[model samples]
Target chain A: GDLNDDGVVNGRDIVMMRQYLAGKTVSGIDKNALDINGDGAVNGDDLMELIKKVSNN
Target chain B: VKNETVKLSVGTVSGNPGDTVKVPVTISQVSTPVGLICMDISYDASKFTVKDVLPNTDLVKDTDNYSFIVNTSTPGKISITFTDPTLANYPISVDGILAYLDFIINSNATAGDSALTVDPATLIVADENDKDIKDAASNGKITVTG
Candidate 1:
């Protein structure tokens, strides 16, 4: 869903995901949007999925 | 790429079911002065419940000048962010107790070892200038019996 809104999924998105997993209030972003792995939670699992997305492209 | 080794250790602990244990988190071998630190800690919720987090008063004097937030709402996770207002002008370099986390063993906790680990990727140690300090992290464990 372009959580970072840079029009791309990149390292900055990874940082945002990290902040979310760290429990920082990431305002205006739905938790599901960051749940790249559809695991019903935003966590290291989704984080790795995003990394894989970046690596594949 | 500069290299330095800073260790953040969660002290080893042992306790019986229904008992509470204080876990000490410490930093040592700091290659650079640090004034701000953020840590994300995780444990086996089935083994223990986080009770409270206590900062080392002696190390964090001028208590009003510092602030930290500890979130444990999510089971098995404790995220902490500590900031020292005086860091810009007075950075602390000494190594000792940073804070203590109190955990209560679950009533039905299994008798075994539960790992208490820090998320190294999210660990941040910053100098007064807000520069990132490169370092490695080591995980600790807690043993439960009876």
Candidate 2:
């Protein structure tokens, strides 16, 4: 679920995921990698889930 | 690509005071390809109420991938937004109909012309990179017939 492909979900993925949820498209990386929640769908919930992961790190 | 600046429009429709009208929201003049779209549409609540919002199935192909948000919680306004599922590469570049705004004409509505506006201040459009571009919007009317 690493959006920026840094090998782990991090802050940059947060920004990219926000872009998609803000009605904007994304590119240059695997869009599926942003699925931090592993729920098969993307939304604000995934963002929160990722934030929790990043905060714990 | 020097080709961009998406334009959106909603046009006039006529119906009896108690009838339901399907007002179309269209995307056109897409000189440049668009990967994402965000729009805010407001209507005259005194004349009609939002019944439902449906994406132009023939265009988006299905309703599952995109978000069709409707907010009439506040009086005299509505909000509609759309996000591309995974079409950043084959972006929607064609000038076509995006959605149909189903409005139920209020029973007490009078015979007159009321407008449905796509407010420019908050409406948005962007490219595949998620960068916003210049955009133009148009307002339309709802003619309440006798």
Candidate 3:
């Protein structure tokens, strides 16, 4: 349950992350997942981490 | 802290005046022997109006029978209830749509965003034996645009 909690780590989950950053409602929502960069909130840093995860950057 | 694994999310949608949209209520994980899930939703009646409730077939399967009701008489208030006995044996354990709240954007709706919040005090989830289940909920929003 990395991003969207669909039990899969994929692009859709990344989309959910972006949605969370934009203050949009997302499914399989979790506060923990929001802090992907270990930051206090879902922000640009977390988005960068997610992008890196997907791109192996 | 609550397990917070199971989630009941009201979908976010956008539509124009006179257009009808189905706002979905989704279950993140139907992990338990769910017999009932009830909640009341509040919205700005002037922005949008509820039409009906569409029960998800995959959730309320024919064999795993269930009943659904939506009360819309109260302005700005929508009450929903779902219950079944077969749920104990055939519980829904996947991410799925539970129900859809059909709504029509008021022809006179102003272009903007509207908040649709679920009354936390009225929210209830129960197992087949009528035992309570713990879960988290978040309010949904709708954007009305041309």
Candidate 4:
């Protein structure tokens, strides 16, 4: 899925494009907060926010 | 170059054709006919030869038919490459019992073509329910840059 959901970016759309990496579920475990960018799909952007949040706190 | 395995899972399967034993793949715990996750799997499948590409440790092979028992609790995925087989640089398609979750060979350039220009058109998946999984996603311009 598209992190920005802009429909114009390439596959890297989820590659650190924004704060799409917040509160992400590791595997298919917990997906409640995986919608980091709130656009759905626990993709790269969501992965990015997840790492940052974990690292900061 | 080695062949890459595109990760895929079977869903809503009856384990046999003409059976409504739908083993719908529940991605993220959502039960549906079909859905595409952001996960994309690619392979070159050049390292391993055909003889070496045997069934996984989870499978038990007999005379001509192989019996594969999936525990469901522990899901698994794998990749194949050219160094493991003798198919050389030819494109081949592998299929499951139902032949729905199929994959294509994506490496070894011929003439003046590059691996990047190769695409899999024969990689079609037909489920017991006549469900087509080959069109699961869009195969747009793919570029592998490390």
Best by lDDT: 1
Q: Could you give candidate 2's per-residue lDDT for residues A1-57 as a string of tens digits?
A: 577686754434554776777776667657766666788887778866765554334
Instruction: Please state the CAPRI-style docking class of candidate 3.
Output: incorrect
> Model 3 clash pairs?
none
> 1 or 3: which has the higher TM-score?
1
lDDT per residue, candidate 3, B1-146, as tens digits? 34445778899999999999888888875577566666778999988888887878787654222245556768898876665523334445567888888888999999988988989876777665456778667788889988
**Sorted on TM-score, highest at the top, how do the candidates line up?**
2, 1, 3, 4
Tens-place lDDT digits, model 2, residues B36-129: 6656788888778888877775556434433333455566666654545454534667888888888999999989899899889777677666
Which prediction has more favorable lDDT, 1 or 3?
A: 1
lDDT: worst 10-residue window of model 2 chain B: B61-70
Which candidate ranks first by DockQ, i.e. highest? 2
Residue pairs in candidate 1 whose N, alpha carbon or C atoms collide under 3 angstroms: none
Better of 1 and 4 by lDDT: 1
Each prediction's RMSD to truth: 10.5, 8.2, 17.1, 20.2
| DockQ for each numbered candidate | 0.04, 0.08, 0.01, 0.01
Query: Distance from true position, residue B96, model 3, in Å?
Result: 0.7
Candidate that beats the other on DockQ, 1 or 4, i.e. the better one: 1
Cα-based lDDT at residue B136, candidate 4 = 37
